[PDB]
Amino acid sequence: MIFEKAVIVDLRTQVLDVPVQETITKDNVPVRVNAVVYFRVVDPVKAVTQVKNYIMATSQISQTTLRSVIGQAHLDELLSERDKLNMQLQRIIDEATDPWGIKVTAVEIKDVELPAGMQKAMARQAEAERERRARITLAEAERQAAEKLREAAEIISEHPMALQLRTLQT
Amino acid sequence: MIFEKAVIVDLRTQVLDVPVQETITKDNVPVRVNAVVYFRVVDPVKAVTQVKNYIMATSQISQTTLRSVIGQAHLDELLSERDKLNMQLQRIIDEATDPWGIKVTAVEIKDVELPAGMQKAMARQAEAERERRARITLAEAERQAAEKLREAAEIISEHP
Amino acid sequence: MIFEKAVIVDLRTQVLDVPVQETITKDNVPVRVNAVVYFRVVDPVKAVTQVKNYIMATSQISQTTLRSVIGQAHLDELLSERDKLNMQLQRIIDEATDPWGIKVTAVEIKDVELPAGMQKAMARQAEAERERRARITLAEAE
Incomplete structure (x- = not known):
């Protein structure tokens, strides 16, 4: 037949990588930044029912937010207030995500890259x-x-x- | 020179991907299922000695055990009671394992593929x-x- | 636009792989060994500024120290008292590393090869x- 990954309730945290983005700080500095989302499908019916592919949907809002956030952020907040950034990132991203039955647990920025x-x-x-x-x-x-x-x-x-x-x- | 990894006592937990088994649930549903085995070598003499390749042998009892356990389980069990499965998996495997001097600590079903x-x-x-x-x-x-x-x-x- | 990875006050531990060292043990057994270095950056300014590249430089002295610690160790220590050698390495390396702003938390010997x-x-x-x-x-x- 044709098989497909079952969307079942998660037992341990699932982890998704947000692809690198190029965008400019408020501040005015171009940057490349990526990060990591930690989540757990809490209600598989919503995850299947409410978006076509929740993995990709989450991947989307993740980028939109990471973009947006960096937009309203000073170079220094990316290099020096991670804790607050990621928390800001978990907040927006978990919220966006619940229509789909996903609890987002944390979202830590991975690497930040600047002009050489x-x-x-x-x-x-x-x-x-x-x-x-x-x-x-x-x-x-x-x-x-x-x-x-x-x-x-x-x-x-x-x-x-x-x-x-x-x-x-x- | 030609060298080999040495089989030492494991200070930390080694990880081992169990190759996908595709098979039929008790239930009768066709299924692709795979798992991670967590383990530590505990008697390296036993491990070098009772089995030609202990990583291989762990892969196969794990493979065979999983295939059996799935054949016994009802579809809903895989989806909703993973934990119970997971746990017997560990019991049955760690045991099978013991002659080779291995401690299997956990065994956790990873992805279950349903027919689309x-x-x-x-x-x-x-x-x-x-x-x-x-x-x-x-x-x-x-x-x-x-x-x-x-x-x-x-x-x-x-x-x- | 050509970019580089910003050094930042690491929040969660970084992980360096020490490339393989082929050397003899004190015992005289020939051996291929390697190790993981766990570390956080603690003072970016130290790390960007004191040393051309903090990674290459931690990898280098990690090699050198791994090499030495082995030569000084008996095969059976390597396979059987790894912990002792591990801590040994942690101590030397963390030290070397402070000029650069880096806290090295552990160094652990990973894979060990003896002759076939x-x-x-x-x-x-x-x-x-x-x-x-x-x-x-x-x-x-x-």
């Missing part, structure tokens, strides 16, 4: 601003310490006794 | 039944909310 | 010894 050379520059320049921050922030702490210090030196001079009554309950 | 079209048939029928049922309950629920509201109504009429 | 037929011999003879200590314990009891 870019991350070297981005590495160098962040190394540079990490320092330039250390400078200013410190130079600041000090300018202020200097102020409060000069301020206590005035009070101590004008009020010789001010350090006494405080020393007198030790 | 059969499943759409069942789903659509399934959907139609829930669709019927829901029409009834809706009316029974409406009707009764009506009456509880009707008897809500006397109480406030005859007694303000 | 040698285990088939070690196996026969080691079973002989069990047919020995099993009868020197059934004429001693009764």
Whole structure:
């Protein structure tokens, strides 16, 4: 005959790969990004009944969302707030998916790829601003310490006794 | 030099795809079914020694066991009680296995292929039944909310 | 547009395969061995910046260290006290790796090749010894 995979209730998590996309961050940087969907057919009748091929349907919304999301996202959110991204991804994608009887469990972004050379520059320049921050922030702490210090030196001079009554309950 | 993988004690679980068996359910439905065997070599001497190739031999008892177990099971069992199957599979296999010094830890049926079209048939029928049922309950629920509201109504009429 | 894989603070463990090393054991047995390196990136900036390619470079010192640890080990350790060698490797390698921002969590020896037929011999003879200590314990009891 002709055989076909049975759509039965899932016991262990099924895993689907979302194909690479090219799209631009909000931010303005072109990127290629792919990711992984973890799901479990919870109601096979809906999965068979409500979409033609739920595997491909899920594959679709997955791309649409991953595209969309990156659209409204700063380069930095892809490189640095995965946890929040994937969570954002699970949320939208699980929801979309329930008409079809699929529970989406997690959706973690797999690899992110950027224009070549870019991350070297981005590495160098962040190394540079990490320092330039250390400078200013410190130079600041000090300018202020200097102020409060000069301020206590005035009070101590004008009020010789001010350090006494405080020393007198030790 | 010519070398060979050595049969060591397994620190982690090895995995082994069981080749598809196609066969008839008790039920009488034609079926393509395959499984993953999880295992660990536990006595490497036994394993190198009692069986020419232990990976091969595990593949075949697994194959044969699965074929038998499927022939015993009713279609619905494969679809809805996979877990029970899965478990006897592990029992029967791990045993068969023991002479060769292997621990089979789990054995999990992977994909069951039905003859095509059969499943759409069942789903659509399934959907139609829930669709019927829901029409009834809706009316029974409406009707009764009506009456509880009707008897809500006397109480406030005859007694303000 | 030609792209590259962004280094990021890994959330879930990465997995490197150490290519095969053919070498002799301390025992003098010739042997093909290999290993998996489990690791997370912890400081991208370290990793992009300190070293031309963090992968090639972890793979290299992973080879070198695998090579050495073997030469220092007795065949039977290789097959029988893998754990010890495993940890050994973890320690050396994680270390090497910090200049680059990488936490190496485990290194595990995967497949081990001996010359064709040698285990088939070690196996026969080691079973002989069990047919020995099993009868020197059934004429001693009764």
